[PDB]
Design a protein around this ligand. Structure first.
Ligand code: HEM
Ligand code: HEM
Ligand code: HEM
Ligand SMILES: CCCCCCCCCCCCCCCC(=O)O
Ligand SMILES: CCCCCCCCCCCCCCCC(=O)O
Ligand SMILES: CCCCCCCCCCCCCCCC(=O)O
Lengths: 415, 415, 416, 104
């Protein structure tokens, strides 16, 4: 009873597990429409793609994030009742706290700490037979994130803290044991950080003004009250965990360098401009965030479709980032496409669209870019290495997707 | 005043632990009364026995089940706040859900799956030195129950899941370590099944209409709302666990065939009619459910006893099944006593009395009988085996009870 | 307001309290020449005091309350959540009478005698062992005796685990990091273990005996006649079992005192119960255990030219008061003879609290602690001879609680 | 007879001391108490050092050898595994005693 296409399959959630990052795109292509209806994740939903749909998706008067996604994502990736599900001035108030910790001075400090760690790892890498970049990245990022945040990290817990952080990320689009590893990792990380929050509030743990642990421990909401120690820990996890999740992008950028070697000498000849272009294309080209979920706040009409209050809407991030209407040859890795490109908040949304200060767009975008640029500079200039025979293939069905090998490296030598 | 027999001892709960299935009958015999007063399980109680008392016990205007038993039974056998403690229209509404899953077609299906599994196990049994029927029964029943319910069950977890189910059953009448194993097994099973409920509601787990997992996940109460995912998991476990608990009756059936071999050829020359009589006598003769607890809902007088509102009342299941006024030679195993016998809902109550549709009587009675008939048919026609030297003794003080050896078999060969 | 009252203005005072421990308050009362100073401690603006006169005001229940006084960390490790230590008013007195009813002189005598038989039985094994750690031996014996006297079943294969969980809770009350987390994990294990007992008892499924701690906690009724929650009843029973095991600290300090002051061995041997009580009291006064106590100002009042505002945190220095030269001549010296002909006072000797135990929060186990210490000291003096080999007997005044590092390891043990 | 008397008197002291522990226990298995007491008494009388944290495992190893002499299968294999552990544990004592590094 509508001109809006309707997928009437009742197993669509299971097909989403089968198709992953291509579920919405396969159907927007099939139905010749930027939007279609489908029962997904237990809700009658509308899936939409494209920059114009992203513009509507980020209209906070038309869309809310509360109760948008199933509880399984909060219990694994986000944390229960955290910022991802907040709306109104309360969300903006808490969003300002996250943004205050991810300013360019923070981005520069984090990238510089990573540069030091990469250079120091060379002396052990030269003595190893093989090195898995994903494993080295997750442990370096965990060590750097905690140090930069004032979070104590003993050397005997680095691997278990980093694995717990990655287990949460690796579980957001999974069922069965991969999803359960994140469900068990989250309570350990929350208990671990909440103790620091309580010790800090009693003065029994030294904190430093301007760092994430201190600002989370002593942040006050709009009513002047502090966050519950568990919520303060959860929101600190929403800083430490995604910094470790940069490991995925670091492996993808290394895979892109390997699969497209002409950009290797192109990066050496250039400077930070060419590294940023490469890093932006890594974020646009490779999969990470599949889609975003929202609920319709008030009845409205857009693109000849009636959005009723309460219906779930999913915005295809991967499809928008591979839209031929916005990107020429979208399925090709071409860093040159970002040369002299005007800033657009809705055609490139691997970490969200719109304004971070007025919406749910990722505030760690700058940190992600600067850490990637520094890690790319290290791979290009500091060391030479072989990429031995391995399964470099990554599955689009799997969410999040990662090359099975993890970019194993051998024959590592300093330049 | 009452002037009804009164056991004035203060350690009666400890005496119930040492006398078990005979505690109520020892005192009804001693007091020459169908009922007596006593302080049991921390409550001033009245124990009663006989079919007439069973008729009164199942008057839902006179009796309720809410708050009738200590919390220890919920936290081990039943689950907290499940069907066993419900009253009124809400209980009948949930009771219809269970009954819809245990109709004769379900009984036939479960019995047929059991036959197929028994026959396949012969190849393994012929190669083994000894086989413990109890351990084989619980694992087969667990795999058959989960497959029939639509509950996924990996081969690497069949033993643990079946052990967790049996631990809950083996703990309902225990104190100390035996009871604690059921207190620890219950949260494991609830968490295991609850994940399935939430995954099914999100469409991420395939379910099939008419199976237990589906019907529990999408059952709606009187107000049209579905159960909490934990409640739905608890009530699904109230289907899976008692199916595994049939292992007790299967072991007792083999013990009856061994201790009274005159019935082996009697069953051989007979058919389903003789298997019914044998299976029914196994349920009447051997102990399983000791007694049932209820609370007096309103003041009433029965058998010259004034039942005050709120007092605890225990109905002797075991003693009623061995009542010489209802069964000739009640302490003898005589399957022929069920030859062309009319339906009586209160003289034979090993799995409750009254109407299962209008009360708390076990809805799995038909499933239990049909699975027992199939397993008995298998032991009689399909294999020959030795019963080596073992302790086949079972204690009437241990609740639940089981032959100590578990009817270990050897020399197994197909026929 | 209180600009005259001295004021430590450091922002890291909670961290300095961790590194100074039992000496944090005395260092500043000596520094400021005052029984009173202000400081931000444990996340609250506080006033620290010391001396017998300060203790008198601290135990004025109209001026001070215990609810919300300490951080929740102490409840989650030592006390238990919402237990007797944080209660005020008639409800506190009611539950306090329950504890006192289990720690009367008949209970003190029973526990002390149970200790004596266990010490004597241990000699047979001690003679066959190369070395014996008194701290490890005490906590096991104290746990076995406390559970037996309380009616708490204790399997032989769980004695070490239960005793370790009790000490983990005690050893964590003044710590941060791993040492504190051990108590944070031990408490749920102990609470769950005891709560099943409370549930089985209330159902008649576990035998209890009137007059024993397990029975009295399981069937204690509040002012409104209702029973405690099964979890709360277990928590308060642990507030009896655990502190009995905690006597292991005092037992090691007593043996440390005999070794470090050998002249009192013959003094005790040539004496009787009088000299043992004097030695035991001096062990409690001289050695550290209870650092300070916390309370909230119940209502506005003025004392010692200081304005106490309702809600402000106040910490009473137990250690410093016990070493106050105004009350004890040569206070930093172990002199058991100082307790001969000592007038009984409720505010100058406060290692386990001050005031009246029946009208305040003073430790009701003081009598049990003394009687068990006397019997243990009697055994160490008359029953056995032993060597104290080379070991680290040092105990840090910054570590809360404190213990000689070795735990007074003994060797060459033989009967007398 | 002097060695017999000494071992019996050591046993007597151990039985008497055990009563304090037995009075607080719900149950006591005589076989398990006898094997541990005998192991401690035998080692002490022999001059063999025996830490309290190893009494159970040393006594278990001793009984495993005895309980295996007329058995086949797992019961016999327990003794076949306990013997190398006990032989190695005692040969180190012989080694140290002959070097004067263990008091005898
Ligand atoms: C590895 C690279 C990253 C990717 C692909 C990514 C992606 C995303 C996506 C898709 C969202 C949801 C956006 C929305 O709802 O509109 C998000 C939100 C968020 N991200 Fe990231 N992110 C990354 C790195 C980071 C880092 C390193 C941090 C922390 C320093 C971070 C912090 C956050 C926070 C706090 C939010 C919630 C923002 C809010 O709800 O207002 N992210 N991110
Ligand atoms: C092994 C044989 C079994 C025995 C001895 C047994 C016995 C009992 C007893 C004594 C009750 C309590 C009756 C009452 O309160 O009046 C009961 C209830 C119940 N049984 Fe069974 N049962 C058996 C098998 C099963 C099986 C195989 C299932 C599931 C397929 C099952 C499902 C239930 C349920 C759902 C209830 C609760 C009914 C209600 O409260 O309305 N039982 N059973
Ligand atoms: C025999 C073992 C012990 C038992 C059963 C015991 C019991 C208790 C109880 C029940 C309380 C709470 C009283 C209240 O809040 O009203 C308490 C408080 C206290 N106990 Fe003990 N105790 C024992 C040994 C000790 C020892 C050896 C010390 C030495 C450090 C000690 C020091 C304290 C302190 C400082 C308080 C707090 C006093 C206050 O808040 O005013 N106790 N004890
Ligand atoms: C099939 C399950 C449904 C899929 C749920 C998708 C969850 C949307 C959020 C994805 C954000 C990307 C995560 C990057 C790492 C981080 O920021 O923690
Ligand atoms: C300590 C006294 C016992 C407490 C009262 C026991 C009441 C429960 C009786 C239920 C018998 C049937 C249990 C087997 C089937 C199942 O798994 O549910
Ligand atoms: C940050 C320092 C903690 C504050 C001090 C908390 C209470 C100190 C006094 C209690 C000492 C009692 C310890 C032995 C008895 C017991 O086990 O309760």
């Amino acid at each position: 009873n509508e001109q809006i296409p309707h997928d009437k399959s009742l197993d669509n959630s299971l097909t989403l597990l089968k198709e992953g990052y291509l579920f919405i795109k396969n159907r927007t292509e099939r139905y010749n429409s930027d939007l279609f209806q489908a029962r997904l994740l237990g809700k009658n939903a509308i899936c939409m793609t494209g920059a114009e749909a992203a513009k509507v998706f980020y209209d906070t008067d038309r869309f809310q994030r509360q109760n948008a996604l199933p509880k399984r994502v909060q219990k694994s990736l986000f944390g229960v009742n955290a910022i991802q599900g907040m709306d109104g001035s309360a969300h903006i108030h808490r969003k300002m706290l996250f943004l205050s910790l991810m300013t360019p001075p923070h981005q520069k400090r984090l990238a510089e700490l990573m540069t030091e760690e990469w250079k120091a790892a060379v002396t052990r890498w030269e003595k190893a037979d093989e090195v898995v970049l994903f494993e080295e990245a997750k442990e370096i990022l965990c060590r750097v994130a905690c140090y930069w945040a004032g979070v104590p990290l003993k050397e005997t817990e680095v691997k278990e803290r980093a694995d717990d952080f990655i287990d949460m990320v690796d579980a957001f689009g999974a069922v069965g044991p991969r999803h359960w590893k994140g469900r068990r990792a989250r309570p350990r990380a929350e208990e671990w950080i909440e103790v620091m929050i309580e010790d800090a509030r009693a003065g029994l743990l030294k904190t430093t003004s301007g760092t994430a642990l201190h600002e989370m421990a002593f942040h006050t909401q709009e009513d002047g009250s502090q966050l519950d120690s568990r919520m303060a820990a959860i929101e600190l996890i929403n800083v430490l965990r995604p910094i470790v999740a940069i490991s995925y992008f670091l492996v993808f950028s290394a895979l892109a360098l390997h699969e497209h070697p002409k950009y290797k000498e192109w990066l050496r000849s250039g400077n930070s401009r060419e590294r940023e272009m490469f890093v932006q294309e890594v974020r646009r080209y490779y999969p990470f965030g599949p889609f975003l979920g929202a609920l319709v706040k008030k009845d409205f009409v857009w693109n000849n479709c009636e959005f009723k209050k309460g219906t779930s809407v999913l915005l295809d991030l991967y499809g928008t980032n591979h839209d031929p209407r916005l990107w020429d040859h979208p399925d090709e890795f071409r860093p040159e496409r970002f040369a002299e490109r005007e800033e657009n908040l809705f055609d490139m949304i691997p970490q969200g669209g719109g304004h971070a200060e007025k919406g749910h767009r990722c505030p760690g975008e700058g940190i992600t870019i600067e850490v990637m640029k520094a890690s790319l500079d290290f791979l290009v200039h500091q060391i030479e290495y072989d990429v031995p025979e391995q399964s470099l293939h990554y599955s689009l069905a799997r969410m999040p997707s990662l090359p099975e090998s993890g970019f194993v490296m051998s024959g590592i030598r300093r330049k």
